Design a protein around this nucleic acid. Structure first.
Length: 90
RNA sequence: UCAUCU
């Protein structure tokens, strides 16, 4: 079950070293947790799993253990995310 | 799951 699909949001922050971040939903203005494994289309020219602070992402919302979370996270229209400056380019 | 990392 998916609570919401293709939600658009702005990354609040994402910690590359520790592997998680938060996205602010553009529709409800609620922060949602995003795990590194929830990123579906990583920047193919970085080599870590990440989204970058402030970038615009598109995602599904599902029920987590500590609140609703983001999953299937991509750029708008399913394109690769930009990724974090804390994740070096190849 | 509110982290603090080039």
């Amino acid at each position: 079950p998916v609570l919401a699909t293709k939600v658009l949001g702005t990354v609040k922050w994402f910690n590359v070293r520790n592997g998680y971040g938060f996205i602010n939903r553009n529709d409800t203005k609620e922060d949602v947790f995003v795990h590194q494994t929830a990123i579906k289309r990583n920047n193919p020219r970085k080599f870590l799993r990440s989204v970058g602070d402030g970038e615009t992402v598109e995602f599904d919302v599902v029920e987590g253990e500590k609140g609703a979370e983001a999953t299937n996270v991509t750029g708008p229209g399913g394109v690769p995310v930009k990724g974090s400056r804390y994740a070096p380019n190849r």
